[PDB]
Amino acid sequence: AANIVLAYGEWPEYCPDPTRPDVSVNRFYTLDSKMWQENSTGWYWKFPDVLNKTGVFGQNAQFHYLYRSGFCLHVQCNASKFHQGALLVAVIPEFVIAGRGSNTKPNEAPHPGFTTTFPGTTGATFHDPYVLDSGVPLSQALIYPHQWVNLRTNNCATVIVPYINAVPFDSAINHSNFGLVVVPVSPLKYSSGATTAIPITITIAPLNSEFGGLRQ
Amino acid sequence: AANIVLAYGEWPEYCPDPTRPDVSVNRFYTLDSKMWQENSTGWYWKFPDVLNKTGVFGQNAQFHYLYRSGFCLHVQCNASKFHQGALLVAVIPEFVIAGRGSNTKPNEAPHPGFTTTFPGTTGATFHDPYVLDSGVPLSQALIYPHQWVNLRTNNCATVIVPYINAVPFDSAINHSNFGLVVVPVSPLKYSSGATTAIPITITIAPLNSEFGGLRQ
Amino acid sequence: AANIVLAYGEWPEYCPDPTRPDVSVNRFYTLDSKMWQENSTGWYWKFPDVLNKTGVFGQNAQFHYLYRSGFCLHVQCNASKFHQGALLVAVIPEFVIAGRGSNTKPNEAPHPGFTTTFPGTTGATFHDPYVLDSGVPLSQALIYPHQWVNLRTNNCATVIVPYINAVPFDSAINHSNFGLVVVPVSPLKYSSGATTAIPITITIAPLNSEFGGLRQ
Amino acid sequence: VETILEVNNTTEATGLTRLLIPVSSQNKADELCAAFMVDPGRIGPWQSTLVGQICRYYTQWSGSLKVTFMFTGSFMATGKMLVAYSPPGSAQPANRETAMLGTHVIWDFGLQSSVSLVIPWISNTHFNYDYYTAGVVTLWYQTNYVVPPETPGEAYIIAMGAAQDNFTLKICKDTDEVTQQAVLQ
Amino acid sequence: NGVLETTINHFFSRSGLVGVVNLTDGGDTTGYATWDIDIMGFVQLRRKCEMFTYMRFNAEFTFVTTTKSGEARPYMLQYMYVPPGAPKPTGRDAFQWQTATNPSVFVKLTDPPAQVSVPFMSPASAYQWFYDGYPTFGQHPETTYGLCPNNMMGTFAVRVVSREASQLKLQTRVYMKLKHVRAWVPRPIRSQPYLLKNFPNYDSSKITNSARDRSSIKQAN
Fold first, then answer.
1. What DSSP line would sit under E128-155, residue for residue?
2. How far is the CA of D180 from the CAs of D50, D59, D124, D176, E91, in angstroms?
3. Where are the alpha helices (DSSP H) in chain E?
4. Can you tell me the distance from the alpha carbon of D3 to that of C7, in angstroms, rounded to the nearest whole number?
5. Is E202's CB within 8 Å of B131's CB?
6. Is E49 helix (H, G, I), strand (E, B) or coil?
7. B-interface mutation test, from D78, D83, D98, most B Cβ less than 10 A away
8. How far apart are CA C63 and CA A156, in angstroms?
9. Phi and psi at residue B142, in whole multiples of 5°?
């Protein structure tokens, strides 16, 4: 709670005068924690996906043709004072993974599978995080809205992101607005006898939500 | 719309200062019409049942442990000026059907089956309507809130009923507050060549609803 | 009299400061009624024609070289409550029928005969009404000034049309400003024993007339 | 301007009867009468309308549309229809019961001889595998068609539709509606 | 012209006989007698309180006890009232009778009758004799239809106070007066006879007509 990252210096707002679910969708969703250990390579969550199949929020999104909202993300890491490491918590818009294992043709180019593109509630894991699986240089990932969660210092990272897109409304199932990337820049180290695997808990509050086009 | 029957001269109200679904549950539900013909014996609908498995109202009632509301009922009968007959539209609280086909013992007494007690969305049909299947004298059914729909005169009957019960809140699945009985007192008659079967449409608006005790 | 159709939202007027026949031409002309039956295909009247050979209006038009006026048209259909159907009453400017029965050349192309182009007082009858004998899509005929005369509802259709043309004055005999098309969109149906053929009466009042260039 | 849709276009009634959709006594209650997709710009019932033919000259459109029904049955006849609109992405409603849960209008003939239904929003978007999913409107028998004796037991609904004020078009183009290519001579 | 005889309270007044219970001493097996409070017992008062749906009232019981020959003798009796939810006496000598929370009245047989009042005992705001539904919340998978535990008013039990058994034989007429009566949402009153005690079930084949017939419709007696 010491520092919040407010993405792009702009707060979520409603449609700039399409319905609102009152306060009904306002509450914390707590994802299954990820277990971070010496060799852990990082994780990511395509965001207007993670909540698609779970919760009251999930029933709205699957049954409505258009969707709009921002989010508030809290990433906590519980660990002792004898553990050490650092993570990079970043929210990167329109995160698009890429086919690796090069075969360059019009035909056999190895495009990612759906389970690899949209991971679901359990998120996915980077094959090689150095490029963020985008082919892009992770060392530059600090451009995006980001926070360092460093076990030496505060263990929490919170980031508010507004709704961003070229259009006011878009489908919740097909299009994933932003992904959430968590990478272990400096590897986790611990002395013998300490607990081996450190959990990572991400809590997400779909604040300021809108829906439309209900399907009976 | 000429005359509304306001049951027991008292309007629906909320809990006398337990939550409210805003205006979200406010809309007409139109049941499958019943087809009334020369030999038709009448119908009934256990009311906080009919809507239990159908609609947004239905999802609330099955997922909430306590329930409260009143209703507004519209019964229309479409038919020509050459058809004739009369129906008795009555809303009778705590309508309890009875085992007929007497065998009087502690053991083999023929109690009604669940499909006979709670009919569902399609309602049920009186074996012998003269007693209303209660053993009680239908000729006295005019006690309850009632309306005559007489094909000679206006073909619509509307009745508003408040929530009535000994307790403020009760379960929606187990307990059926009131039943809706529609009987063809004077039989339908028509000349040869006219349409044989006359439809009966009942529209119900769960106005002033409350729920509580949600179950994840 | 419930609804009048005022063509193109503009009232008839005199010459925008060529003589006027005082009130002498102001009165109803009632055409011979058309007899509409199951297979009836529709009718039309080239309008500054119908009145050309009949009445005091007719003597002026044949003896004057220039002509100007608007009209008021009343189309009544008398029929029981057991008859059913619908007609489309439309006033379509510069209605030009077309040669059908395709032979495409400069020479033998089957142009319409005069009796087919200008029908006279008794009007004419569409071969195939689906194209309005213009080759154009009748389903779009609702563009023009129009009224539905539906036996289920009111049986009268009235339309006032102003004088429209590229020139202020034009000959009454040669040029037909607008035609009046009456088509039986939904066919006439009646039960056995009812009167078979339903009459259609069209009354026309040449309001706001002018003439010029008398010929002794 | 609201112009007539052809909702019965199929190889049976060919003629002016192609503009009319029927109702009868033999059809039991709680079953489908007719349905048509609502888009101006594709083949089928909208090619007859102006809004349908005028959208051929433009690549992108969007706005609200207005669909209107009219009943030609006898003054003595009576009944009810359920006319419902399912937004795009939802498939053909299978049952009246699920159809009711959407946006619908109960329409009783004896009362109103005409009903109207405003589809809220509809527009095209690209960038035949896309197949442009849009909404459909279905028309159900709420109750069987009631008719007195010595009266026809078969009637027609006639459907017509038009754009509303906020409907807009853009990016002009020529029509594929005509293959003619210069009759001349 | 005085309305007071037609008020809903006067109509339920006038204590009648709601039950009778017999008592005989062998001393061990059955030395006692128990009577559950039920006002559905006889058909006069049943048919009256079944013309309403919800009713709220008090009860006043008077116990008239005599011997088999009828002549009294100064034996002492104990009337125990076990409120709803308490266990009932299982024997003359059982420990149930010394429970402090079960009120009792010790009265000799030669005295005027013993008399007590009972409050309105339901957890609900009124009794209801017509319940449409099931008592269970446990998702009944599907004889339990219509029976609500809410109407349990308690129980009386009777014994003779003595160290040994006394060979006398008794029966107790119990008269119940019904006070402060409020009634709601009336019903029609039953035409058909009753078959089962606690249930509306009637006879479908034998149905009796509500009005006795006559010769012809157009001849009036």
1. ES---S-S--S------TT--GGG---E
2. 20, 21, 27, 10, 108
3. 8-11, 43-49
4. 17
5. yes
6. helix
7. D78
8. 101
9. -65, -5
Using CA atoms, how far residue E2 sits from A66, E5, E7, E178, E183, in Å, is 71, 7, 10, 22, 21
Question: For chain A, first and last CA: distance in Å?
Answer: 42
CA–CA dist A110, A133 (Å, integer): 14
The verdict on B214 touching D (C-beta cutoff 8 Å) is no
Contact present, B88 and E165 (Cβ < 8 Å)? no
Nearest to D30 among B32, B193, B203 (CB): B32
Tokens of C103: 């032979």
Q: What one-character DSSP code corresponds to residue A152?
A: T
The Cα–Cα gap between B73 and B75 comes to 7
Please report the resolution in angstroms.
Answer: 3.1
Show the tokens assigned to C186.
């939904």
| Token pair listed for E30 | 């059955």
Nearest residue on chain B to D148, judged by CA atoms?
B194
**Domain ranges in chain E?**
1-221
The answer, for A213 touching chain D at a CB cutoff of 8 Å, is yes
* Residue B27 CB contacts under 8 Å (≥ 6 apart), including other chains: B205
Residue entry with tokens 């490491």? A85
- What is the number of domains present in chain B? 1
D101: which chain B residues are within 8 Å (Cβ-Cβ)? 54-56
Q: Which CATH number fits domain E1-221: 2.60.40.10, 2.40.50.1070, 2.60.120.20, 3.30.70.790?
A: 2.60.120.20
Question: What three-state secondary structure class fits A131?
Answer: helix
Distance CA E216, CA D168 (A): 79
Method: cryo-EM
User: Do chains C and E meet with 3 or more Cβ pairs nearer than 8 Å?
Assistant: no
Count CB neighbours of C38 within 10 A: 12
Chain E contacts of B104, Cβ < 8 Å?
Answer: 195-196, 201
Whole domain around residue A92: which residue ranges? Answer: 1-216
Q: How far apart (Å, rounded) are the C-alpha atoms in residues B213 and B19?
A: 9
All structural domains of chain D, each given as residue ranges with its CATH number in brackets, are: 1-185 (2.60.120.20)
Q: Are E165 and E26 in contact (CB under 8 A)?
A: yes
Answer whether C107 touches D (CB < 8 Å).
no
Instruction: Count Cβ atoms below 10 Å from residue C151 Cβ, excluding itself.
Output: 26
The torsion of the CA quartet E195, E200, E205, E206, rounded to 10 degrees, works out to 50
- Closest Cα partner for B185 from B141, B122, B153? B141
At E37, is the secondary structure helix, strand, or coil? Answer: coil
Hey, what are D63's tokens?
A: 């706005």
Touching chains, E (3+ CB pairs < 8 A): B
Among candidate residues B48, B45, B21, the one with its CA nearest the CA of residue B201: B45
d(CA E128, CA E108): 37
- Nearest chain B Cα to D154, which residue? B195
Query: How many Cβ atoms are within 10 Å of D72's Cβ, its own excluded?
Result: 24
CATH code (residue B195) = 2.60.120.20
User: Minimal Cα distance from C105: which residue of D?
Assistant: D185
Structure tokens at C31: 């055409």
Tokens representing residue E210 in the block? 């509500």
- D127 is written with which tokens? 């960038």
**B192 close to D (CB below 8 A):** yes
Closest CA to A116 of A135, A131, A130, A96: A96
Chains B, E: CB contacts within 8 A come to 117
Q: Which residue has tokens 């906020």?
A: D166
- Report the distance separating Cα E119 and Cα E101, nearest Å: 15
Which residues of chain D are at the C interface, by a Cβ-Cβ cutoff of 8 Å? 1-6, 15-20, 48-50, 53, 70-77, 113, 150-152, 154-156, 158, 160, 185
The neighbours of chain C, by the rule of 3 or more Cβ pairs under 8 Å, are: D
Q: B128 and E210 in contact by Cβ < 8 A?
A: no
DSSP state letter for C131: G
